Design a protein around this nucleic acid. Structure first.
Ligand SMILES: Nc1ncnc2c1ncn2[C@@H]1O[C@H](COP(=O)(O)OP(=O)(O)OP(O)(O)=S)[C@@H](O)[C@H]1O
Ligand SMILES: Nc1ncnc2c1ncn2[C@@H]1O[C@H](COP(=O)(O)OP(=O)(O)OP(O)(O)=S)[C@@H](O)[C@H]1O
Ligand SMILES: Nc1ncnc2c1ncn2[C@@H]1O[C@H](COP(=O)(O)OP(=O)(O)OP(O)(O)=S)[C@@H](O)[C@H]1O
Ligand SMILES: Nc1ncnc2c1ncn2[C@@H]1O[C@H](COP(=O)(O)OP(=O)(O)O)[C@@H](O)[C@H]1O
Ligand SMILES: [Mg+2]
Ligand SMILES: [Mg+2]
Ligand SMILES: [Mg+2]
Lengths: 325, 329, 319, 348, 261, 261
DNA sequence: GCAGACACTACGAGTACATA
DNA sequence: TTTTTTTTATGTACTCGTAGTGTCTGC
């Protein structure tokens, strides 16, 4: 049947084989499940890489639908996870048996970086004393916000960013399930603008399919509003090759016609700077000035003056690069 | 029969009345047709129409009788703590989707949670929205409205489909202002509407406010360019020429005199920074002088954004441009 | 029955099975053999064997009377101000018949979580009933335990386990489990352990379950290299104003998925104990804090970290 | 009553200066659909007088019947914070900066209960109420972010007139939602005309030289000019042209502080200047005005090639003072930087 | 259209008072047989099975089957202002979100229509094994409420044992031990106060006192309680209402470990 | 000089806490007919009239029309020090700025005297129009306090509808709508429960919950309460208290939504 | 049958701190 | 060889004092 769902939730890897990237980690967790030797897991990485979906597929593989409510205790940041919850419901779930069928239980603590340090210190002996009865899975995006005791007690798997070569078949599966007309440059634009994020890949795909009806490079870069790489090359050429007035006029006309934002222009110019064989002092000056301009855009500032400063940071270094020779 | 200001009289009551935001309007019209609406993130400059677009979309999706049952609006004028997200948002997200439109129009099978001004929401309260958005996506949708997307955490950025609201172009803004002036039976010259769409800088709310205030000040006759220039707080060009003459003189006493005259005349320092930048990028100065003057202008604009004193920032900017103008002399 | 993981399955049950800190563990063996153990506080890094040493000492001292003469309190318990007054003091007053040289042991594991008032109420019950009861404390941050409690106990400090000390226990686990291995795979396990026996056992069990063999490629396919081991040379390149190699290390850490907060935390951790000039270190730390305020404010991109690296390179060239 | 309060104009037709702006403000509020107002300008220009004249144009004479209303507002920390509001039967005057950093609670709770209820009488009163928010530049950005949706949801039954000195401290979401009304300071001729009409209404004779000196010394502040003119008539009833004008104590204390700065450049003199700045800060003088007075006095003793660097240092340390929370650190940092620069200039 | 009419208002008060600090939210499953409720607690340790028969209600009609998950803290506030001698009507439509509660005042003069917003939780059905038990004990509910309250003063976990002789309650605490052994109290004038042993095999298990004390707040529902115990299946506290249905309370045993010595 | 003497200590101990969180000051106006009090809330919503006639006092002396203002922050804490069934008197000199009240200490042995400073506030009498209301109804006192408490758990604003059948209290919230309909309670033994309707014109107005909860804190003073509603006149909550006078409340209605077709 | 006393839990209030 | 005090905005955790209230004792 059809459901009114976002494509990040309509297409979720309910089984472990539907995930794409981390094949060694998923194979090791599958061999943990098959041997019934599942340890305390610590899944960390950037968002959108498949940490929640992995443990949900593992929980559905370990437990049946008639025993899932008494075997899995899933708590996240939307629930209260204070120290009275660690001493209360979590300890009573860990220290007791099951109801229907005998087996080890699972405590899923999603977004474990948001927990307080008192709760994390109270979690240590609950994990250690009841290893035979229950298992604890900790999910976080920041490993520095989890205490080193819980990092020692749980074996850590890094769910790194998804490579664009592996995000193509899952996007093709979503495309062929949703009847989406997409070209090759549309797929390249999706996997370039995602930057190791499967969630925003499906979000950009759904928004581009609804906005235009076809997914090409121009439709993706128009719906997202991201500048094209030819536009960034033209901006760099104007900033490095002519005077202040003509570069200001050309960059202002390009930003007015294309409807560009200075944040993405700064990001792509920062990526272009390290590719250009600059002198070291010129590179340091450009990085400091671009970081200052990027910091200035986080408040109620005028974007035209910051665009002029972005032009100025290269108009200063024109003479230094040329006189370096 | 009470009068209403034109920003609320000409608020978009439907998606088709929203101007220039073509991609999100097409997405919302597809959601009106019955397509799968994802979680939305609206960001951009003020006055571009982020709130009016989602309010028009919600009132077209649910209608008058189901707007109170399917739409929850939470903004910075009400308390949004961690407990408000844990209790008020989560219990609303877990409610059933029921109730049908009595006019025969189709109704989508979800609710809409509108979190306007998500910049002011704390990082702890934003972390509690993550599994609420993921688990309850079968029965509710979330629209986050903000101005700076860096003030929303990366999980909520990844969970929402981002739509950036561009500043309105001169053609679309001029067309909308001429339509509003046509419906209000007032007349405005072409130079007046050109200076209005130049002054408003893509802010359509500012343009509508200036048009209504110029109509009230004018009384009903022709709206010229002088009333627009006086009503916008635009500094005259003779003051800018006097500032640059005091900088070319190389004396700090005349610099203090023109800075005190501009401060005592009540001119805003942001308008002075904009006009000084417009003169600086369009003259016959060298590239290095223009470069460090524009960088000082950016620093002064950043300091004015953080609520520094206008007099000290303006005299520092004037000292810098005076040093640049008297260095080559 | 469900088999325990190798961290808990191969927990030592005698004090002679505990590797590392040979003098302190040997003195604990002597005190378990003879008796009359004083109050002790064992401090050190996680996974060193403090709780294992305390529990093995309590098992060797008490034996069959472990159920009635031992009180084990964790951070998962309450242990507030009213537990020290009404449960610890009542257990210290409790009459338990024990052999000569043996006292009741009140084990207060992870004493960092205990509040200041509870530790103030813990002093006189430590001092009065010491003829019949004893205290065994374990902690990580020993400064959180107050000075009067540390004066009332023999403060033991555990250091990080070396490569050979972890390697001996790993060889024992391998010979108990018949794990095929190579030398460089065990060196990779030691390198990923970083002085932690828990992480060594977890990485060994993960590599054995996922691949069935211990070489360097099977260890590094599931485990990871430690973070500050490359941040150290990134800071070294920032000292010599080498912005290109520092950005290469920064981009390599960025493409592995590390958040900017973790990267700048490792940068501050390296710069706190780096070997350079003191004034240069102070201005480096001030620049790190200035960038960390921007990261916590909301702006956190690769351009901000590159600007931080460029500012750290400038601070060298601006004496 | 003093001369600042006895001869204040009541309606827009009795204003001595900015008469074209007075006619424009009369034409603005006649129909009743006028938007939110942002009355801004220098202190003493006449912003509050024109706001009260706008309220006189909207409602009747009953807006002058003011009374003190005491409100108790509960923080999220459950600490009772007391604020005072001046209210009439037609409008309310709120200064949320009196609550300090808890002004966001005042905006979220006190203003929303005012806006959510319509007026009792709709015949003597009009269809909408006016809320006067005074010194909105001193509001934090959280309170201004809390302000913006109330300004759009209830703008048919509740209007807002915001008063401030600088619009740079007002966030662009608030500035986009309201019409900005600029009230400049009166000129020397305008202040001389006002003082001459006040002295003629008092039966006195005011010379043009004394009136010009009172206008020049007041720095185009008509309130301070009227106070100085009344002080000059209590001090000496024959208005001489070269009659001395009394001075404020904190201004001459700031001048002597800057003279102590330029007299000696030592850490001991820096400690003495820190004590003087502590004495200035304890008397509830704002630190930006301390920076402005220091820069106004230090640049008189500097050479022509040194003033720009001192002005840039003063702006930089005032920006760091606005970013920070302890003003004495940034004030002493600016004084120490000026002492180092002055010693380097004098020794070379 | 679902329309259930409570003949008495005291039973709905006494059911909800027992589940107030235990059941997170009420899952009313409605069919032609009656009203069912199988919901776990917040800690996923206890399970509550409630079955109200159709013949117990004053009037009961049900066209199509419904599953109306609703909040219980919201249901607690509307049941405090409910009389103990009046009829309460439960109403809900086919495709609506409002659960209507219509009753009378304690002053008995005004209607009181209390609507509740239904929740949309997707809860999987828990499979009750319905197997035999190695111990079945009939017991008064007043005595079972007293004994679990009396042993909460000594410890926090009770080692409740049963055999051919009778049920035995033990609680090892900080002060010491409290051992209660009651057997064969059927030789009294009343019929509710009786201890009857049905099954054979002895079983010793340890349970938390917090959940057992929550189970004893259903004491005014039934004058006699039934305890079921076995070595594998959990402990069942079966209340049987006289003319309305039955209530079952499940509680998992705690993990206990023998000393190595 | 002003001197008055009460007949019971509970006629001031039960009315002052109703004004404790409602109004910030208690302005007593002294006249030959009696003592008047008309104070308005700081939010310009609530308005309380309290007049006690001179015949109900034990004794009463009034030669000049004097008005005194005192704050609720200091008179509340000395009210709990005073007794319940003791006698209370109030004394005020003509020229002094001190209000002295003499009563009995709760040990019933010694004279306890407290002094309060007179706050000089320049207020004016608003003046009730005393117009004929569109609704007049009679409700019990103790039952009406239980009405507004029940709608306090639902929403922050209640809706009052008074047609010819009775008075309907409604509150639509995030939990669900709570509707009651008090009507036709004339067949009771006690005369204070006689619910009756004295007018014909219906009206529907919404009011704030918080001040109506403050209005129900003066309920044990009288046996009944009288409610008066109109189209634009504020709601009147009238208490006929004992024998010495009557108490009157006023509450401004809330805003109405733009529900035009 | 109704007034006084006993401990019971829920709730209001004050305070500290949050890193390596 | 030298010691007083309240500001930062939330969120959590701890600790202590207080007040309706269910239940028991008694004439
Ligand atoms: N490896 C993957 N393979 C396939 N789809 C994926 C993968 N990772 C993410 N997705 C998609 O993205 C959605 C969200 O994935 P999540 O598991 O929630 O990511 P996540 O790692 O949990 O990120 P955070 O840290 O929780 S915000 C899923 O429902 C899928 O549609
Ligand atoms: N795109 C638009 N089309 C039509 N009218 C618009 C548009 N944008 C703004 N307006 C008008 O200006 C008013 C302000 O629109 P908003 O939706 O509040 O803008 P905004 O994006 O919410 O600004 P911020 O960021 O909240 S301060 C609307 O009520 C309209 O009257
Ligand atoms: N010195 C050691 N010798 C042998 N095994 C050890 C040693 N240290 C740790 N282990 C193993 O690691 C497990 C955990 O050791 P613990 O003593 O519980 O850690 P810990 O020293 O208490 O550190 P924290 O601060 O409590 S995380 C033990 O069960 C052993 O399997
Ligand atoms: N048009 C005018 N004619 C005479 N006096 C004026 C006029 N406008 C302002 N003033 C005087 O100048 C002073 C300015 O103070 P105020 O009106 O509060 O403005 P601001 O709020 O800018 O200080 C007032 O005391 C008032 O008496
Ligand atoms: Mg997740
Ligand atoms: Mg908005
Ligand atoms: Mg330990």
């Amino acid at each position: 049947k059809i459901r009114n769902l976002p494509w990040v939730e309509k297409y979720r890897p309910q089984t472990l084989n539907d995930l794409i990237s981390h094949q060694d980690i998923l194979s090791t967790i599958q061999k943990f499940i098959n041997e019934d030797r599942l340890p305390h897991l610590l899944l960390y990485g950037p968002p959108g890489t498949g940490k929640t979906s992995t443990i949900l597929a593992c929980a559905k593989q370990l437990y049946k639908d008639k025993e899932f409510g008494s075997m899995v205790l899933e708590l996240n940041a939307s629930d209260d996870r204070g120290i009275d919850i660690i001493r209360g419901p979590i300890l009573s779930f860990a220290s007791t048996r099951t109801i229907f069928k005998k087996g080890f239980k699972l405590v899923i603590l999603d977004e474990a970086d948001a927990m307080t340090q008192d709760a994390q210190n109270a979690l240590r002996r609950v994990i250690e004393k009841f290893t035979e009865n229950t298992r604890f899975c900790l999910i976080c995006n920041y490993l520095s916000k989890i205490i080193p005791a819980l990092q020692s007690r749980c074996t850590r798997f890094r769910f790194g960013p998804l490579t664009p070569e592996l995000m193509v078949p899952r996007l093709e599966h979503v495309v062929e399930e949703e009847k989406v007309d997409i070209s090759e440059d549309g797929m390249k634009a999706l996997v370039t603008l995602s930057s190791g994020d499967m969630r925003r890949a499906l979000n950009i795909l759904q928004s581009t399919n609804m906005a235009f009806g076809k997914v090409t490079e121009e439709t993706v870069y128009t719906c997202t509003g991201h500048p094209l790489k030819s536009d960034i090359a033209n901006i760099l050429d104007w900033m490095l090759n002519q005077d202040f007035t003509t570069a200001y006029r050309n960059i202002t006309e390009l930003k007015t016609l294309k409807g560009l934002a200075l944040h993405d222009i700064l990001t792509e110019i920062h990526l272009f700077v390290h590719r250009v064989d600059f002198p070291s002092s010129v590179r340091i000056h450009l990085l400091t000035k671009m970081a200052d301009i990027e910091y200035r855009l986080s408040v109620g500032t005028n974007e035209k003056i910051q665009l002029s400063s972005l032009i100025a940071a290269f108009q200063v270094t024109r003479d230094l690069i040329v006189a370096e020779a | 029969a009470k009068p209403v200001p034109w920003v609320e009289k000409y608020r978009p009551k439907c998606v088709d009345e929203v101007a220039f935001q073509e991609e999100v309007v097409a997405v919302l019209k597809k959601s009106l047709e019955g397509a799968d609406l994802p979680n939305l993130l609206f960001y951009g400059p003020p006055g571009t129409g982020k709130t009016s677009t989602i309010l028009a979309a919600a009132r077209e999706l649910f209608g008058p009788e189901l707007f109170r049952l399917r739409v929850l609006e939470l903004n910075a004028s009400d308390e949004r703590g961690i407990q408000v997200v844990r209790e008020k948002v989560k219990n609303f997200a877990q409610l059933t989707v029921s109730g049908s439109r009595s006019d025969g129009k189709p109704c989508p099978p979800f609710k809409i949670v509108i979190l306007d001004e998500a910049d002011s929401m704390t990082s702890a309260a934003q972390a509690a929205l993550r599994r609420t958005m993921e688990k309850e996506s079968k029965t509710t949708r979330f629209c986050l409205i903000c101005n700076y997307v860096s003030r929303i955490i990366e999980p909520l950025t990844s969970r929402c489909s981002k739509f950036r609201f561009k500043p309105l172009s001169d053609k679309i803004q001029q067309q909308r202002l001429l339509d509003i002036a046509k419906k209000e039976n007032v007349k405005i010259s072409d130079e007046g509407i050109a200076y209005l769409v130049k002054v408003s800088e893509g802010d359509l709310r500012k343009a509508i406010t200036f048009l209504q205030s110029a109509t009230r000040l004018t009384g009903g006759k022709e709206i010229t360019e002088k009333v627009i220039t006086d009503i916008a707080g635009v500094i005259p060009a003779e003051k800018i020429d006097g500032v640059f003459a005091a900088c070319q003189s190389g004396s700090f006493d005349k610099l203090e005199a023109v800075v005190k005259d501009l401060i005592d005349e009540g001119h805003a320092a942001t308008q002075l920074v904009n006009q000084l930048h417009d003169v600086v990028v369009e003259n016959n100065l060298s590239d290095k002088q223009k470069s460090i003057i524009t960088e000082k202008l950016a620093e002064v604009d950043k300091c004015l954004a953080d609520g520094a004193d206008e007099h000290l920032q303006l005299i520092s900017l004037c000292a810098t441009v005076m040093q640049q103008l008297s260095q080559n002399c | 029955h469900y088999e325990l993981p190798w961290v808990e399955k191969y927990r030592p049950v005698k004090l002679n099975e505990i590797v590392g800190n040979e003098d302190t563990v040997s003195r604990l063996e002597v005190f378990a053999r003879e008796g009359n153990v004083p109050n002790i506080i064992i401090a050190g890094p996680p996974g060193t064997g403090k709780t294992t040493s305390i529990l093995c000492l309590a098992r060797a001292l008490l034996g069959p009377a472990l159920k009635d003469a031992m009180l084990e309190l964790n951070a998962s318990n309450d242990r507030g101000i009213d537990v020290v007054r009404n449960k610890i003091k009542m257990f210290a007053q409790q009459k338990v018949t024990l052999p000569k040289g043996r006292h009741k042991i009140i084990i207060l594991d992870e004493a960092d979580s205990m509040t200041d008032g509870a530790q103030q109420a813990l002093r006189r019950t430590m001092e009065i009933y010491s003829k019949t009861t004893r205290f065994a404390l374990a902690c990580n941050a020993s400064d959180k335990i107050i000075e009067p409690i540390q004066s009332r106990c023999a403060v033991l400090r555990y250091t990080k386990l070396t490569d050979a000390q972890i390697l001996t226990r790993l060889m024992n686990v391998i010979e108990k489990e018949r794990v095929p291995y190579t030398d460089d795979g065990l060196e990779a396990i030691i390198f990923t352990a970083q002085g932690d026996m828990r992480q060594a056992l977890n990485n060994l069990q993960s590599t054995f379950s996922g691949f069935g063999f211990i070489n360097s490629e099977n260890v590094f396919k599931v485990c990871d290299e430690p973070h500050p081991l490359l941040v150290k040379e990134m800071i070294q390149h920032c000292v010599n104003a080498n912005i290109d190699e520092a950005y290469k290390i920064l981009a390599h850490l960025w493409h592995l998925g590390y958040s900017p907060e973790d990267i700048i935390g490792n940068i501050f951790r390296v710069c706190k104990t780096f070997q350079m000039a003191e004034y240069l270190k102070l201005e480096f730390i001030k620049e790190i804090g200035y960038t960390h305020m921007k990261i916590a404010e909301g702006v956190n991109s690769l351009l901000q970290m590159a600007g931080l690296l460029a500012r750290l390179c400038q601070k060298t060239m601006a004496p | 009553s003093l001369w600042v309060d006895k001869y204040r104009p009541c309606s827009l037709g009795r204003l001595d200066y900015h008469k074209e702006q007075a006619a424009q403000l009369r034409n603005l509020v006649q129909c009743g659909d006028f938007p939110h107002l942002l009355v801004y300008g220098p202190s003493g220009a006449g912003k509050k007088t024109r706001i009260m004249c706008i309220l006189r144009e909207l409602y009747g004479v009953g807006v002058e019947k003011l009374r003190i209303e005491h409100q108790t507002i509960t923080t999220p920390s459950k600490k009772k914070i007391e604020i005072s509001t001046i209210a009439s039967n037609y409008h309310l005057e709120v200064n949320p900066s009196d609550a300090g950093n808890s002004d966001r609670v005042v905006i979220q709770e006190m203003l929303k209960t005012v806006a959510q209820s319509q007026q009792l009488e709709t015949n003597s009163q009009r269809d909408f109420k006016v809320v006067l928010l005074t010194e909105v530049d001193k509001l934090t950005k959280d309170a201004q972010h809390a302000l913006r949706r109330t300004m759009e949801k209830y703008m048919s039954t509740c209007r807002l007139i915001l008063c401030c000195n600088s619009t740079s401290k007002v966030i662009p979401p608030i500035r986009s939602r309201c019409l900005a009304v600029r009230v400049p300071a009166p000129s020397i001729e305008d202040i001389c005309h006002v003082l001459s009409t006040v002295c003629k209404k008092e039966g006195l004779n005011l010379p043009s030289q004394l009136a010009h000196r009172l206008a020049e010394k007041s720095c185009r502040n008509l309130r301070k000019a009227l106070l100085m003119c009344e002080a000059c008539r209590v001090q000496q009833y024959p208005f001489t042209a070269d009659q001395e004008i009394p001075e404020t104590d904190w201004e001459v204390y700031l001048r002597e502080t800057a003279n102590a700065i330029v007299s000696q450049q030592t850490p001991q003199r820096l400690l003495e200047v820190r004590g003087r700045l502590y004495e200035l800060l304890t008397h509830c003088i704002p630190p930006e005005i301390i920076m402005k007075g220091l820069l106004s006095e230090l640049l008189h003793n500097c050479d022509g090639q040194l003033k720009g660097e001192v002005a840039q240092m003063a702006a930089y340390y005032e920006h760091r003072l606005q970013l920070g929370s302890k003003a004495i650190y940034h004030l002493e940092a600016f004084v120490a930087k000026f002492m180092a620069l002055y010693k380097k200039f004098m020794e070379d | 259209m679902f329309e259930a009419r409570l003949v008495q208002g005291s039973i709905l008060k006494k059911v909800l008072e027992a589940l107030k600090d235990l059941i997170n939210e009420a899952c009313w499953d409605i069919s032609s047989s009656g009203v069912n409720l199988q919901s776990m607690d917040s800690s996923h340790v206890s399970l509550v099975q409630l079955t109200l028969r159709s013949e117990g209600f004053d009037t009961y009609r049900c066209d199509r089957n419904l599953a109306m998950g609703v909040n219980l803290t919201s249901m607690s506030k509307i049941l405090k202002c409910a009389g103990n001698e009046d009829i309460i009507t439960l109403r809900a439509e086919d495709n609506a979100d409002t659960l209507a509660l219509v009753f009378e005042a304690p002053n008995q003069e005004k209607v009181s229509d209390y609507e509740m917003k239904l929740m949309d939780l997707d809860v999987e059905q828990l499979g009750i094994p319905e197997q035999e038990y190695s111990c079945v004990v009939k017991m008064p509910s007043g005595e079972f409420a007293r004994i679990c309250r009396d042993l909460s003063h000594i410890g926090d976990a009770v080692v409740i044992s049963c055999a051919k002789d009778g049920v035995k309650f033990s609680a090892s605490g900080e002060l010491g031990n409290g051992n209660i052994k009651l057997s064969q109290t059927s030789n009294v004038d009343k019929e509710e106060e009786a201890v009857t042993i049905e099954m054979n095999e002895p079983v010793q298990l340890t349970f938390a006192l917090r959940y057992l004390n929550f189970f004893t707040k259903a004491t005014p529902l039934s004058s006699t309680v039934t305890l079921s115990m076995s070595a594998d299946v959990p402990l069942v506290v079966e209340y049987k209402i006289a003319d309305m249905g039955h209530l079952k309370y499940y509680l998992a045993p705690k993990i206990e470990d023998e000393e190595g010595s």
